[PDB]
Design a binder for this molecule. Structure first.
Ligand SMILES: [Zn+2]
Lengths: 148, 312, 50, 230
């Protein structure tokens, strides 16, 4: 009767029913893609019933097939997600540091600066958003037919 | 979803996955996968902490990759709370990436130009940089070495002489690596994108949880003259098949209507006749068919919850 | 846009907007004030004596 | 799209979807985690209840015909709710009309003419005076049927030609005028003429009339379809 145990009428055995019956990388990849919410399958239950999951998860992490949230205490995969984008690492660190150095101009002035550069500004300055009796014996018989 | 929307979504995904760490992809991808997402719901989806969600939201807010929306939500059976919702404003996000992409390339271009300029000189003691033009006015009387002004010590040539090729190599890598972004922007420029708002973005919402404490609804205050910085953005067909009986039936209906129409126009009775003499006004075949049917049968054989509502 | 009634509270500027019950109230951020003042045209603030 | 969106049912948030491919159409509500699932067949809906646009709430109830069944859906955006209200209205209106309708309801020669027994029976049944002569002269007297019709060839030919002639071709779809609520008056003669001029209509008619839905629904969809306009 318990939901965590699966019965086998073929042999008459009781086997543990894991939350996600996955034992191969191919099955895991399709399982994540089938998720309807953005919640990541916890490695705690995925590791249970799977002799090796970090090795498989790490293999997929290198290939950018899935998204993995890493622990802060010790390196260990937490809830994972399907990678709907491209490669996870496709930019050199020498440019990431330069990305941090870049400081964006004032919001109200960005379109003007971009327009001065000649690039099409996909936005506008918010300052331009223009926010736009006689015969009283028939007290209630008369219906207001004001227009036609 | 329009084809251009996919391009913008791809552009945002590439930028975050490349120019941001790992956790940043998780936060932004959730906002893209869903519509406006409450902070509490966002926390449950990613199972990240406040001290971990803070830096991610804060950095993704400074770069304008994710917008914020604050409103007063009034749950009916509990104390209310001011809710925070995170979404993406494509026109603003596209501009932020466009400027940053240009800025990064410009810095390398300036550095490439700067490196092509003569090296210069440096002083080991005071660590003061002197250009070639400036150094020429500080050399000793012997005309043998450049002497510092503050230290009066021989100058040492500056570095970056051999980097002339390195800076060019770095620039080449940048354009090749950022190539997907530039191609995406070109397609983005071709089409026109409508600015997103908390209400507009809410139209594509996919609820995160079965019972979310955050009420994903917009309830603007009536007659609210307030304007906040950057919170404003730009029958039934019935058919009837008529059979032979219906056709004759319909004909009689018009005939009755025609008679009524004629009566509506017909003059009154008193106008019809001159009323002078009258007193002044003051206060069986079936059996035959059956036998015939049987007879031919032989011949053929022979020959052969109370709320206001309306009705829509 | 309807302009607010601005009053000084401490070292901050607080602006109130009159509705079309009680008037709307919020704090005018210094960044907002700086953004607006930069938009004033040359002729506009010369009339103010600057 | 106008056939799906987010909705909250019984204080549970989920995605509301409108299924029209399967006849009868049914609305399926699926919870975020899928723990609870609710499906309702649109055929059971009597009226469509929607909150006024002047109220902050954006609810939408589908009341079922009988303690009438009630399904209440809460939306997040008026446009999303509006995008689903109009689509739902179309399904109910067409099915309501279908329910209303359901509740409311050569051979000209002497040889062949003398041999076409069906025509001889057909004309005789309508004619009564000929029955009087035929009954006495053929049933009792015993005159051969062939001899009786020998002298009445023009009578047989005249009756046959009445039902043996057809009108000429003409632009049939142009005559139809839809004339909010719009009503049209089709007829059996119009139905046959449409098939002859447009074989495609007949092709879609023969393969769907008994299978999926009754004829009134088919023609209601056809006129509303872009095919009728094309
Ligand atoms: Zn020095």
């Amino acid at each position: 009767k318990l939901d965590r145990i699966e019965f086998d009428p073929k042999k008459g055995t009781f086997k543990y029913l894991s939350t996600y019956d996955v034992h191969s990388p191919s099955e895991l990849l399709k399982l994540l893609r089938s998720q309807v919410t953005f919640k990541g399958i916890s490695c705690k239950d995925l590791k249970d019933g799977w002799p090796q999951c970090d090795e498989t998860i790490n293999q997929l992490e290198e290939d950018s097939k899935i998204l993995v949230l890493r622990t802060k205490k010790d390196k260990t995969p937490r809830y994972v997600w399907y990678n709907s984008g491209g490669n996870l690492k496709c930019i050199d660190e020498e440019f990431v540091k330069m990305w941090e150095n870049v400081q964006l101009p004032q919001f109200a002035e960005l379109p003007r600066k971009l327009q001065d550069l000649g690039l099409k500004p996909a936005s506008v300055d918010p300052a331009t958003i223009k926010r736009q009796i006689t015969n009283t014996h028939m007290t209630g018989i008369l219906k207001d037919y004001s227009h036609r | 979803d329009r084809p251009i929307d996919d391009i913008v979504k791809n552009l945002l995904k590439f930028v975050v996955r490349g120019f941001y760490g790992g956790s940043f992809v998780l936060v932004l991808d959730a906002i893209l996968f869903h519509s406006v997402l409450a902070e509490d719901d966002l926390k449950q989806l990613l199972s990240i902490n406040k001290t971990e969600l803070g830096p991610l939201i804060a950095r993704l807010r400074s770069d304008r990759l994710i917008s914020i929306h604050k409103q007063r939500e009034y749950p009916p059976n509990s104390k209310s709370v001011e809710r925070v919702y995170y979404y993406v404003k494509y026109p603003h996000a596209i501009d932020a990436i466009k400027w940053k992409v240009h800025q990064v390339v410009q810095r390398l271009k300036d550095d490439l130009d700067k490196n092509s300029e003569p090296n210069g000189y440096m002083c080991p003691i005071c660590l003061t940089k002197y250009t070639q033009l400036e150094a020429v006015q500080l050399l000793n009387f012997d005309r043998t070495e450049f002497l510092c002004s503050l230290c009066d010590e021989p100058l040492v040539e500056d570095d970056s002489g051999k980097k002339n090729k390195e800076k060019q190599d770095k620039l080449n890598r940048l354009m090749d690596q950022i190539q997907p972004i530039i191609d995406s922007l070109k397609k983005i420029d071709d089409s026109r994108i409508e600015e997103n708002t908390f209400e507009i973005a809410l139209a594509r919402l996919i609820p995160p949880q079965n019972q979310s404490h955050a009420a994903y609804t917009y309830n603007p205050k009536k007659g609210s003259t307030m304007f906040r910085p950057g919170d404003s953005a730009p029958a039934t067909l019935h058919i009837n098949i008529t059979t032979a009986s219906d056709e004759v039936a319909q004909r009689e209906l018009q005939e009755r209507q025609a008679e009524e129409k004629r009566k509506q126009n017909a003059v009154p009775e008193w106008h019809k006749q001159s009323t002078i003499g009258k007193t002044a006004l003051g206060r069986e075949e079936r059996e035959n068919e059956k036998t015939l049917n049987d007879y031919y049968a032989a011949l053929a054989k022979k020959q052969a919850l109370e709320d206001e509502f309306e009705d829509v | 846009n309807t302009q607010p009634t601005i009053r000084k509270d401490g070292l901050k500027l607080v602006g109130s907007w009159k509705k079309d019950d009680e008037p709307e109230l919020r704090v005018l951020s210094t960044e907002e004030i700086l953004n607006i003042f930069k938009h004033i045209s040359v002729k506009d603030f010369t009339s103010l004596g600057f | 799209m106008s056939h799906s969106g987010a909705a909250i049912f019984e204080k549970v948030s989920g995605i509301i979807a409108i299924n029209e491919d399967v006849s009868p159409a049914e609305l399926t509500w699926r919870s975020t985690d899928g723990d609870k699932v609710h499906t309702v067949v649109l055929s059971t809906i009597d009226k469509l209840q929607a909150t006024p646009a002047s109220s902050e709430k954006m609810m939408l109830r589908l009341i079922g015909k009988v303690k009438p069944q009630r399904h209440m859906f809460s939306f997040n955006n008026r446009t999303v709710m509006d995008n689903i209200k109009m689509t739902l209205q179309q399904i109910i209106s067409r099915y309501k009309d279908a329910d209303i309708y359901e509740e409311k309801r050569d051979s000209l020669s002497k040889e062949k003419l003398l041999t076409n027994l069906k025509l001889q029976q057909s004309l005789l049944k309508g004619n009564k005076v000929l029955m009087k002569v035929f009954q006495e002269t053929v049933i009792n007297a015993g005159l051969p049927p062939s001899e009786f019709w020998s002298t009445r060839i023009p009578l047989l030919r005249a009756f046959a030609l009445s039902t043996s002639q057809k009108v000429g071709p003409y632009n049939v779809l142009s005559t139809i005028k839809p004339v909010n609520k719009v009503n049209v008056n089709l007829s059996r003669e119009k139905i046959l003429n449409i098939f002859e001029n447009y074989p495609i209509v007949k092709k879609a008619y023969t393969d769907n009339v008994p299978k999926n839905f009754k004829e009134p629904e088919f023609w209601a969809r056809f006129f509303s379809s872009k095919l009728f306009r094309k």
